[PDB]
């Protein structure tokens, strides 16, 4: 669950472009070394 949503705010506007721008600055490396 690091794709948010973005938101931003603002307002504004613008166009073309966007915003931012920046590119540049510085760085550280250079610064560282230095």
């Amino acid at each position: 669950v690091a794709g948010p949503e973005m938101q931003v705010k603002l307002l504004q506007s613008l166009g073309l472009k966007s915003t931012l721008i920046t590119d540049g600055s510085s760085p550280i490396n250079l610064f560282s070394t230095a």
Binding site: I28, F31, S32, T33
Partner: protein, 51 residues
């Protein structure tokens, strides 16, 4: 022939292994020690504020 030659290059590869290790180990120690010195030489957070 090939049993003897086999154990040969073998005892060699195993000895030249801890050689590989000893080298690769000692150098990764000088890095870490030099790095620990570099880090400590400027604020534990001077690195953080510069970031």
């Amino acid at each position: 022939r090939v049993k003897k030659v086999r154990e040969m290059e073998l005892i060699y590869a195993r000895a030249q292994l801890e050689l590989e290790v000893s080298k690769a180990q000692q150098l990764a120690n000088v890095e870490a020690k030099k790095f620990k010195e570099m880090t400590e030489a400027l604020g534990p957070g001077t690195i953080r504020d510069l970031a």
